[PDB]
Amino acid sequence: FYALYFEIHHLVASAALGFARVAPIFFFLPFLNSGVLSGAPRNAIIILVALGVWPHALNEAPPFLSVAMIPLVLQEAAVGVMLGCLLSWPFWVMHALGCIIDNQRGATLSSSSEMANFLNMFAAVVYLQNGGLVTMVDVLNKSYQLCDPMNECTPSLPPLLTFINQVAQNALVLASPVVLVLLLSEVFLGLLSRFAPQMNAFAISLTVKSGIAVLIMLLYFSPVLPDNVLRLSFQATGLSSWFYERG
Amino acid sequence: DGQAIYIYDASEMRNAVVSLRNVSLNEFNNFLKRSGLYNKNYPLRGDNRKGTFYVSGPPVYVDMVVNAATMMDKQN
Amino acid sequence: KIPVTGSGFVAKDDSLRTFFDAMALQLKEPVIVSKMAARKKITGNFEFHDPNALLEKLSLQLGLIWYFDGQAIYIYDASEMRNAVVSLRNVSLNEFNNFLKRSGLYNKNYPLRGDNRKGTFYVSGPPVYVDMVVNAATMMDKQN
Amino acid sequence: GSGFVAKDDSLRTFFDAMALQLKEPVIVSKMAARKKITGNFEFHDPNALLEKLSLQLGLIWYFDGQAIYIYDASEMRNAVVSLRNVSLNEFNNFLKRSGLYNKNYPLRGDNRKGTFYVSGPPVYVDMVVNAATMMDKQN
Amino acid sequence: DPKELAISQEMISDYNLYVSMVSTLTRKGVGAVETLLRS
Amino acid sequence: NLQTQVTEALDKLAAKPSDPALLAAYQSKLSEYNLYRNAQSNTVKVFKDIDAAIIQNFR
Amino acid sequence: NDISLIALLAFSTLLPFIIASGTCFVKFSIVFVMVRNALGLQQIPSNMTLNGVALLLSMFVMWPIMHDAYVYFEDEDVTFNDISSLSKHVDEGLDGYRDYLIKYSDRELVQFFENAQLKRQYGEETETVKRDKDEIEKPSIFALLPAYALSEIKSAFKIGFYLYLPFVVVDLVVSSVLLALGMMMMSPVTISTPIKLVLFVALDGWTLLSKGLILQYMDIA
Amino acid sequence: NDISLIALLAFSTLLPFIIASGTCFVKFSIVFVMVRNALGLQQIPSNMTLNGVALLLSMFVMWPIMHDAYVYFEDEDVTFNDISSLSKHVDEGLDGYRDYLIKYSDRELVQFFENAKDEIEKPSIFALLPAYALSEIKSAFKIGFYLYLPFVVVDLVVSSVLLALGMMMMSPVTISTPIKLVLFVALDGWTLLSKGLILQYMDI
Amino acid sequence: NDISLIALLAFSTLLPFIIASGTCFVKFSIVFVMVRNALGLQQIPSNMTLNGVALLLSMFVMWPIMHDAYVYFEDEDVTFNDISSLSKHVDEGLDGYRDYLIKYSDRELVQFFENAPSIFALLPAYALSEIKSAFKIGFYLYLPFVVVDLVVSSVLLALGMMMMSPVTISTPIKLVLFVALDGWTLLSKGLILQYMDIA
Secondary structure, three states, X not given: OOHHHHHHHHHHHHHHHHHHHHXXXXXXXXOOOOOOOOOOOHHHHHHHHHHHHOOOOOOOXXXXXXXXXXXXXXXXXHHHHHHHHHHOHXXXXXXXXXXXXXXXXXXXXXXXXXXXXXXXXXXXXXXXXXXXXXXXXXXXXXHHHHOXXXXXXXXXXXXXXXXXXXXXXXXXXXXXXXXXXXXXXXXXXXXXXXXXXXXXXXXXXXXXXHHXXXXXXXXXXXXXXXXXXXHOOOOHXXXXXXXXXXX | OOOOOOOOOHHHOEEEEEEOOOOOHHHHHHHXXXXXXXXXXXXXXXXXXXXXXXXXXXXXXXXXXXXXXXXXXXXX | OOOOOOOOEEEEEEOOOOOOOOOOOOOOOOEEEOOHHHOOOEXXXXXXXXXXXXXXXXXXXXXXXXXXXXXXXXXXXXXXXXXEEEEOOOOOHHHHHHHHHHHOOOOOOOOOEEOOOOOEEEEEEOHHHHHHHHHHHOOOOOOO | OOOOEEEEEOOOHHHHHOOOOOOOOEEEOOOOOOOOEEEEOOOOOHHHHHHHHHHHHXXXXXXXXXXXXXXXXXHOEEEEEEOOOOOHHHHHHHHHHHOOOOXXXXXXXXXXXXXXXXXXXXXXXXXXXXXXXXXXXXX | OXXXXXXXXXXXXXXXXXXXXXXXXXXXXXXXXXXXXXX | OHHHHHOOOHHHHXXXXXXXXXXXXXXXXXXXHHHHHHHHHXXXXXXXXXXXXXXXXXX | OOHHHHHHHHHHHOHHHHHHHOOOXXXXXXXXXXXXXXXXXOOOOOOHHHHHHHHHHHHHHHXXXXXXXXXXXXXXXXXXXXXXXXXXXXXXXXXXXXXXXXXXXXXXXXXXXXHHHHHHHOOOOOOOOOHHHHHOOOOOOOOOHHHHHHHHHHHHHHHHHHOXXXXXXXXXXXXXXXXXXXXXXXXXXXXXXXXXXXXXXXXXXXXXXXXXXXXXXXXXX | OHHHHHHHHHHHHHHHHHHHHOOOHHHHHHHHHHHHHHHOOOOOOOOOHHXXXXXXXXXXXXXXXXXXXXXXXXXXXXXXXXXXXHHHHHHHHOHHHHHHHHHHOOHHHHHHHHHOOOOOOOOOHHHOHHHHHHHHHHHHHHHHHHXXXXXXXXXXXXXXXXXXXXXXXXXXXXXXXHHHHHHHHHOOHHHHHHHHHXXXXXXX | OOHHHHHHHHHHHHHHHXXXXXXXXXXXXXXXXXXXXXXXXXOOOOOOOHHHHHHHHHHHHHHHXXXXXXXXXXXXXXXXXXXXXXXXXXXXXXXXXXXXXXXXXXXXXXXXXXXXXXXXXXXXXXXXXXXXXXXXXXXXXXXXXXXXXXXXXXXXXXXXXXXXXXHHHHHHHHHHHHHHOOOHHHHHHHHHHXXXXXX
């Protein structure tokens, strides 16, 4: 009767590496971070999620045994923060969208935000409704199919170096139409300041831009914004292009 | 069984083999014939003068035959 | 509403429990299909006129083992067959085979392999057949 | 008149199709269920086709009387056992009459002794060791 | 049994220490990434 | 290898359970094996407990 | 008989992590941190008491489910005579909890874990199961509560977006009326905080959201 | 007596959650923090020394309820031959807490929890303890808006006199926070809101 | 035996500060947020991304050194007769990390922190040198953003457009042509080539 104790004992060892893979996704996601989740039932969730997705069979012995453990943890954390920064893609570009629309109208010039929080919650909910967690779990179920440990897979550096502009060119074209109307309105006001010199048209610019920045985005908020949210969601088929095993 | 009709699904049928130390099968089967619990669909498979047999059926019939057989070895 | 002239069962992606319960009227006994043997599927036009001969052929084409103990028909898949070896201190194998033949649980497809006058033999078959043979063998030595 | 047309099967789908021409069901293990096969086969003499395929593919098989167990060749185990008050000749006469005598994997040992050596599939070795140790306790 | 229980006496305890060691390193492992992302 | 020379002295008292010198030597064997076995059990126990204390301190 | 007490005490020790994962306490706790965060209050109302008020509603709903376990398991005829009937008895004891997981969990998220566990179990050759299992077959107890806890995080964030909306409509018009004047160098959250508190106390969101959550599991009269 | 030793320990280990949820400590500990957030302070004075004085302030008006359960349960008639008469006797002890809770809880909400007059029978103790805590957090929010309100005016008036001059790029938090607290010490608002907070429950 | 467990556990507790002060995470973290401050938009690209990328890149430099430490330390032939003979062997395990650290630091603080080579003399000289290396690369990235605002505020003085704010006009112009030159993939890979043979 020794194997009954060993079956739960190989499991509780296997879930520790399962925790180390999937823990830095629960920090990155907007509907799962420590700001939205408490401390007491958090660590219950993160263990049994990795227990339901662990690729090898549970009763078998894990191949972790004294190969190289401290660098193995830095492997599984590095692929975990890689999966976090890929999964938090459409929330990052949407939160970057709201920061531009907040910044152009004034209202942020105390440096030299609530509106950008509003789009980030909105694209969190509209991502969460249709499907959502089924594709959020599927990419970490495929990551164990292509990055099984004792094989030293890495986040594949030469396509990582275009990651910042990959979200930047999705940020600027999404913030395209409202900064053009705010900018054309400013120089249209400036020609009136050239036609009447002591107008102080800088003061009027704060009064009129906040109405324009919500009005022009009201025309394309409904039919145009929420489909780009589903388009920018990272899907599991592209998981091969971001990783490779080393032997 | 004479008072109600029990209905189970087919995947709940259980079976058992029980040994009578000092009572024959032909006497216990006459106890069931005299009581009224004899069901000809699920009879008692075994040798006619022995102590071991094989019974199978619904759980209210198996748990009655086993309990009424181990409560007839303790009386003898 | 159901226009076909003859008699038969038409299965469209049936899952081996709804298929054998439809055969459970031509066979006059209820059928118990196991849990691992219910994940396989079958589709096509079938007909039953001697199902004890049809069940033997489909248990070899699909890969199954079956057993009929007088009240029901148990069906398992092929990877659930288990084996056992037991020793009898004071009864023979030919004495135990007369108990199985006279009672009615003797199965000629899965016979008992052993020496004719000894205590040891080798039994193998369906999981409801083995745990009965072992339990009656260890319940006759303690009686004698 | 017969035959299987294999297109990338997995050696458990395949050998169950031969379980009608062989009159017994076939049980393939899970380490020997990863190898694959393609090709047009023809089941006209299966007891020589299974023997030829088990040596080209690399397999071990054992038929006890009810089924055909198939393992891969890297699972063969061996054991040495000693009988106190019975010799090798009555245990081999027990297997010749019990039908468990396999001429491909016989028993290696001295003809009148207690110690011998056995190796084969894990259903043959686990039967032979338990049957050998269950006669000495009876004697 | 005095030698078999003794070799199973070490065998339970070292594997229990190994599972606690592998779980404490995973906690300090991901917690270091948490604090470095807060920076 | 202590259990070997433990297990080699029981059979002559089994064949002769009335020799006074043999049971005196057998008791002289078996109480010393009693002193050996719990000593090994108690000594592995501290090496486990102090090894558990480090992870208890650092957790 | 004696080890039934071992099974009882071992069930007893793992109890509050079951309340951490299995019950509906996860719906109340998240939305109560969200109504704290949306108001902008950080430390207050001192979430040690907010765990307690969120726990008492969940116990208030969970009590009829857990009470039938006592009367079912304090039966004097727990001990059967066969090994499979005794394992059948704990299944039909656990069925009242299990169909509760079935009612409130997601369909496809539960359905994903059986296909994910089977290919781990046997291998890739196992064929996938579709929706049509639902009429006859029950899933395992360890493939439910992951997909349950994710579905309840989805529903709690679904609730949390909606009452987050009427505060940011306030927080944009205050940041616009301050820029209607030349008051650009001014922190608008210190003017927004009173009228954020009024829009919750005049609306009285506590005493209708608290009734709303009990209406999402149980009914009245 | 031995089972009562459990319940006597079970009150004591559960005290920092019942005192966390079933008394006016939640109202004192909540208003004492938003007065700091009203003044624009972050870590001054603490979260410890504000909870200490809020604990003692809540311990005044709460002690006589806790005191009567002692003198009621010291009496010699705890030996009863009946099960239900002892169940009545412990029901007769908790009426000091029940009459405290019904005074400050809402009858409609406790009727809602009762579904899932009051003179013949008292409603159950688990049916109204969240209704009490949910009524206190609402009333503390409502009183929290009021004393928040005059400091908005000093926050606005100096920003308007700075915008009246040309200096628009000037952070007014370094000037309003001096003017914020002199409004709170010339009022001497600390010694008077603790007065009316005590007078809200305990009469003079 | 068990004394090895204390050191191999204390490395995990002290790891968040060896990353904070001993490695190239110092150089990587600074220049990203510095060129974000060059553009003037303080919450795009939302600094959790900048710390997400610069952690993975600083992981890639330290990772062969970490594997090289325990490849050498896996050899259990460390026990000997002399107390210092086992002590020199543990120094041989640390020269693999030290050779990274002696390469970038100058020869002025390292002997200054040994009279008042040793390992503990090198880390504050390292992080002080890396900060000094971070500023001169941030300055050369700074000047093409202090010429493009200078020309757009000149054209407003060329017209009669003196009284309008120029930062509300110059900031989209500075952002658009910067992403149109694909600069965010340029300065990242221009930094990782310095430390390693990237790709």
